[PDB]
Amino acid sequence: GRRGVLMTLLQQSAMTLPLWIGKPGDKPPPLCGAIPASGDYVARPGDKVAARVKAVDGDEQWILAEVVSYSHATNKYEVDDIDEEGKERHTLSRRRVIPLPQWKANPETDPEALFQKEQLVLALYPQTTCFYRALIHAPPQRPQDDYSVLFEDTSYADGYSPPLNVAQRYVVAC
Amino acid sequence: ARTKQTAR
Structure with a gap:
């Protein structure tokens, strides 16, 4: 059904995101993990x-x-x-x-290209195709790992969801 | 799109 097609498409895209593999002296580029786009960058079709x-x-x-x-x-x-x-x-x-x-930023080689604990981000909420405000709870430790995030969620007494996992593909600056 | 409101 459509639900399955959607969730499958999301996984595909999260998993196929290439790992940045630099050599000594290289820095992670723009749009590697948390490194922002260059000034006046324009995205390409696709x-x-x-x-x-x-x-x-x-x-x-x-x-x-x-x-x-x-x-x-x-x-x-x-x-x-x-x-x-x-x-x-x-x-x-x-x-x-x-x-x-x-x-994807590799936590083992380019940890400066990851969002820091307690940074405000926009992150894709599980089972949806939309992004919502969240705080980083834990970065990935290994290149396959998701971020853990706390979504702002007024249905909790403290205003935050429990830790939810979001792939690097789907976490951007807020 | 699938929203949180729909999802929840």
């Missing part, structure tokens, strides 16, 4: 993004999406929802598009 989209009824979400085009005439992207049920190709300003990392 690249995955978090995209701030307003529904017809006004609800704003950061959704998982893919760049379709960028117009230098208007400085706007087109992006497509990675969910087939999202039938609208969205036009967005650069401020509504955050490139996802193109490399």
Whole structure:
């Protein structure tokens, strides 16, 4: 069903994210883990993004999406929802598009390319294709590991979810 | 998209 197709697609993308393998003297590039995009970077068609989209009824979400085009005439992207049920190709300003990392940072070689404990991030919430505010609880220790995060969640008395796992592909700066 | 509100 659609649920399964979606979750499978998310796994595929998380798992296929290449590990950055430098040699002595190299630094992790832009979009390796937590290293931000260069100033005035523009994502390429096919690249995955978090995209701030307003529904017809006004609800704003950061959704998982893919760049379709960028117009230098208007400085706007087109992006497509990675969910087939999202039938609208969205036009967005650069401020509504955050490139996802193109490399996984290896905690054993480039730990400065990971988010620090208690950093505020946007992270994809389990069983969804959307990003929400969270604090880093634990970084990955090994290249296969997920982040552990605490989502802001007003259904808890302290305002945070328990530790939930999110892959490096799906954690970006807030 | 699949939202948290839908998910929960």
